[PDB]
Design an enzyme around this catalytic site. Structure first.
Site, PDB file in Angstrom:
ATOM      1  CD1 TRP A 105      -2.806   1.588   0.679  1.00  0.00           C
ATOM      2  CD2 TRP A 105      -1.845   1.651   2.644  1.00  0.00           C
ATOM      3  NE1 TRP A 105      -3.644   2.392   1.279  1.00  0.00           N
ATOM      4  CE2 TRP A 105      -3.089   2.589   2.584  1.00  0.00           C
ATOM      5  CE3 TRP A 105      -1.067   1.973   3.934  1.00  0.00           C
ATOM      6  CZ2 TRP A 105      -3.606   3.530   3.547  1.00  0.00           C
ATOM      7  CZ3 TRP A 105      -1.764   2.538   5.025  1.00  0.00           C
ATOM      8  CH2 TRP A 105      -2.824   3.388   5.096  1.00  0.00           C
ATOM      9  CG  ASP A 119      -1.593  -3.289   7.498  1.00  0.00           C
ATOM     10  OD1 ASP A 119      -2.614  -3.620   7.478  1.00  0.00           O
ATOM     11  OD2 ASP A 119      -1.086  -2.154   7.039  1.00  0.00           O
ATOM     12  CE  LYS A 149      -9.437  -0.840   4.682  1.00  0.00           C
ATOM     13  NZ  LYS A 149     -10.240  -0.165   3.485  1.00  0.00           N
TER      14      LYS A 149
HETATM   15  C1  LIG Z   1      -2.813  -2.718   4.157  1.00  0.00           C
HETATM   16  C2  LIG Z   1      -3.619  -1.548   4.412  1.00  0.00           C
HETATM   17  C3  LIG Z   1      -3.216  -0.594   5.740  1.00  0.00           C
HETATM   18  C4  LIG Z   1      -4.041   0.247   6.048  1.00  0.00           C
HETATM   19  C5  LIG Z   1      -5.171   0.960   5.496  1.00  0.00           C
HETATM   20  C6  LIG Z   1      -5.995   1.783   5.919  1.00  0.00           C
HETATM   21  O1  LIG Z   1      -7.060   1.630   7.079  1.00  0.00           O
HETATM   22  P1  LIG Z   1      -7.971   2.616   7.699  1.00  0.00           P
HETATM   23  O2  LIG Z   1      -9.050   3.408   6.866  1.00  0.00           O
HETATM   24  O3  LIG Z   1      -6.929   3.848   8.334  1.00  0.00           O
HETATM   25  O4  LIG Z   1      -8.563   1.975   8.795  1.00  0.00           O
HETATM   26  C7  LIG Z   1      -5.464   0.262   4.267  1.00  0.00           C
HETATM   27  C8  LIG Z   1      -6.638   0.688   3.330  1.00  0.00           C
HETATM   28  N1  LIG Z   1      -6.568   0.985   2.348  1.00  0.00           N
HETATM   29  C9  LIG Z   1      -7.702   1.317   1.209  1.00  0.00           C
HETATM   30  C10 LIG Z   1      -8.071   2.833   1.835  1.00  0.00           C
HETATM   31  C11 LIG Z   1      -7.193   3.661   1.800  1.00  0.00           C
HETATM   32  O5  LIG Z   1      -5.975   3.830   1.081  1.00  0.00           O
HETATM   33  O6  LIG Z   1      -7.151   4.702   2.653  1.00  0.00           O
HETATM   34  C12 LIG Z   1      -7.085   1.341  -0.013  1.00  0.00           C
HETATM   35  O7  LIG Z   1      -5.911   0.872  -0.292  1.00  0.00           O
HETATM   36  O8  LIG Z   1      -7.869   1.634  -0.936  1.00  0.00           O
HETATM   37  C13 LIG Z   1      -4.894  -0.875   3.792  1.00  0.00           C
HETATM   38  O9  LIG Z   1      -5.351  -1.408   2.728  1.00  0.00           O
END
Ligand SMILES: Cc1ccc(COP(=O)(O)O)c(/C=N/[C@@H](CC(=O)O)C(=O)O)c1O
Ligand SMILES: Cc1ccc(COP(=O)(O)O)c(/C=N/[C@@H](CC(=O)O)C(=O)O)c1O
Ligand SMILES: [Cl-]
Ligand SMILES: [Cl-]
Lengths: 396, 396
Positions: free
Chosen positions: B130, B211, B246
């Site tokens: 990410w 994570d 999620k």
């Molecule tokens: C690996 C990982 C670790 C941490 C997060 C964020 O979670 P949170 O909303 O702060 O509780 C996401 C979520 N990813 C999503 C949304 C985004 O980028 O904010 C995505 O990859 O689209 C993730 O995919």
């Protein structure tokens, strides 16, 4: 990895919750953390908040992420509270607001934005101030220096000392100003003083950062913003970290705002893209619930009217408690003149109790204040007033 | 002060919301940010969440601040999800959890805690990962190094490359592991691989940071935690940053947890006092609403049963969409074998579309994916599947 970590000291303010909770004595009295209590010694949810929450329950159809900067209507309502309807800052699109997790969050966002994106190295904070200011700025890598503020003998703003402390601030240093209800002293600049400081900081090249956690608790929403507006009228750039924790009774929902102001919209939008990048790298995007309650209230004529009267009700109860406290100290034999307390603004009384008197009040009488001698007048009630004052008199 | 600030690049993921919103074409299809959509292309509030919110509306009598580490029942429910009921980590009181604003918040809290309180200088992250991982750790002052992970030719975890990348990690470096549903690849270690990595990282002295943003979206709540539990059984110390965005559909309420584990309770409690100090200097204390919904659900047999079935429903819909996507690409003339997509875990399909194919899909077809080629399968529906696949086939 962690074998060698030394314990952190408990927080001088939030740590009181632990000690108070653990104290099994029945007559305890809590005058510590800066929460409002009503006449029953409770901190209820405001009625306008419950109404807004019922509306949200009925009408929300998603929890999909907000933008990094939060709810747009929330930002617009916040700028109107800060700068006034019809403000040139708003008309000229010179201000961008990010909704943040509380006033604390807004201070940390400002600090990380400044540290990463400007030449800022030092922030000037009043002595005394809220102890967490130093922690927040240091966590971003900024040094904190203190400026004189309070004349304890006369219980006034020592404006000459403040001026002469600040002569050591360089151009490009930040100077932190509490918008109203200075914490802990309760002593604010008069409008003329605010105006004098505005002109001084323009001349000296200081970047003003306003902390505004108590808007509405000194005299009223608009009057309390007069100092910030005196600054806004004179400066091309400033930042405001504001909170709705106290004036909406939304403490635990973490509702605050970091507002960035620059000379024009091209500049503020460019600068603001880096503030959003800083937020993304911190908590990603802000919590909707409390902010959506604030936006729902501020954008609805009926809810707003209810809320503004509840704010007035809290301010007036605290003012009645100030008078009663001063009157009851006199009756319980204090002898000292405490009438200066009546003039202090906001939730607190800074009465000159020593750290040892405060400790003795906790250990021997179960009365809980902060070690600086700050007392939460909003935690006093007609029922706890007599015992509280008897204890204070006993430690004098 | 701000005249010279250069604009930040828009976020590669969250920035899509802006572009998608501004696109006035009617057939647009959103496969970008990792939110779940139901069969109607909506992201509704879960029914168990609405029920919990109704209960909170009826029963909450204050918004008084939570502790710095948040709601105790929330922490206990979180540790049980992570480590399992009856875990020795729990019995031995070796874990402390702070509720945080989202998984992102928990990663930032971990990073600031590590940077300030340990010798940690570098965190190892998978290539790919990410994109905000790098931003979060760098914001705390930590360097990020990448380890190999994905064999794109065979669409598998390249375990030998991963091992040999990580030979460059020093003892005392952090290695970041995604607990399940690797983002973006959808490729997770098998249990045997997790076990091999657990033993390797103990031997090599790496501090594991997990994570865990998608617990329940790979195979189920307990199976998805098996890798973390394999690590927990072998290590004295680790940190877990977990999210309920999620699996509760609580994205915008910012509900996450940072869990610190150390060799014994004296050590974890001492270490945790510094994590709380780091939180205090950041956002002070966490937002109650979303966490209180999670605690309310997890602590009530009826609500929990409803919620766990809703989670199962989301996972199974995404699995049905994976099959339908693969089937429909075939029918619309892709020719390429995409059956590897069926085996990927979580919300996404990482299909090898190039950055230019993704750009062309947006500009010419109004189909929105992330530039890495990551596609949100949870945004696909029976109704948008045909047009989506026709567009993809057209850009191949
Ligand atoms: C690996 C990982 C670790 C941490 C997060 C964020 O979670 P949170 O909303 O702060 O509780 C996401 C979520 N990813 C999503 C949304 C985004 O980028 O904010 C995505 O990859 O689209 C993730 O995919
Ligand atoms: C000057 C000042 C600036 C910022 C804050 C925090 O507001 P927030 O809850 O984050 O929106 C407070 C509040 N102070 C209280 C409560 C506390 O210390 O956390 C107090 O001084 O007791 C404050 O007094
Ligand atoms: Cl913008
Ligand atoms: Cl503790």
């Amino acid at each position: 990895m962690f074998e060698n970590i030394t314990a952190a000291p408990a927080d001088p303010i939030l740590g009181l919750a632990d000690l108070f909770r653990a104290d099994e004595r029945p007559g305890k009295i809590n005058l510590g953390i800066g929460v409002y209590k009503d006449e029953t010694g409770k901190t209820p949810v405001l009625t306008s908040v419950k109404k807004a929450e019922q509306y949200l329950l009925e009408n929300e159809t998603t929890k999909n992420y907000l933008g990094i900067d939060g709810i747009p209507e929330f930002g617009r309502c916040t700028q109107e509270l800060l700068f006034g309807k019809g403000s040139a800052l708003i008309n000229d699109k010179r201000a961008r607001t990010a909704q943040t997790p509380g006033g604390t969050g807004a201070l940390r966002v400002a600090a990380d934005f400044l540290a990463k994106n400007t030449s800022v190295k030092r922030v000037w904070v009043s002595n005394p101030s809220w102890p967490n200011h130093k922690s927040v700025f240091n966590s971003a890598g900024l040094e904190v220096r203190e400026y004189a503020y309070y004349d304890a003998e006369n219980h006034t703003l020592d404006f000459d000392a403040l001026i002469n402390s600040l002569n050591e601030a360089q151009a490009g240093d930040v100077v932190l100003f509490h918008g109203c209800c200075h914490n802990p002293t309760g002593i604010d600049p008069t409008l003329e003083q605010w105006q004098t400081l505005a002109q001084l900081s323009v001349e000296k090249g200081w970047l003003p950062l306003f902390d505004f956690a108590y808007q509405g608790f000194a005299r009223g929403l608009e009057e309390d913003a007069e100092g910030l507006r005196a600054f806004a009228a004179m400066h091309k750039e400033l930042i405001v970290a504001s909170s709705y924790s106290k004036n909406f009774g939304l403490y635990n929902e973490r509702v605050g705002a970091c507002t960035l102001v620059a000379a024009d919209s091209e500049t503020v939008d460019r600068a603001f893209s880096q503030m959003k990048a800083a937020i993304r790298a911190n908590y990603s995007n802000p919590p909707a619930h409390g902010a959506s309650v604030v936006a729902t209230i501020l954008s609805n004529d009926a809810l707003r009217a209810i809320w503004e009267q509840e704010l007035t009700d809290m301010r007036q109860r605290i003012q009645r408690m100030r008078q009663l406290f001063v009157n009851t100290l006199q009756e319980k034999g204090a002898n000292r003149d405490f009438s200066f307390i009546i003039k202090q603004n906001g939730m607190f009384s800074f009465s000159g109790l020593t750290k040892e008197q405060v400790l003795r009040l906790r250990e021997e009488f179960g009365v809980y204040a902060v070690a600086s001698g700050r007392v939460n007048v909003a935690g006093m009630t007609p029922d706890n007033m007599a015992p509280l004052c008897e204890a204070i008199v006993a430690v004098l």
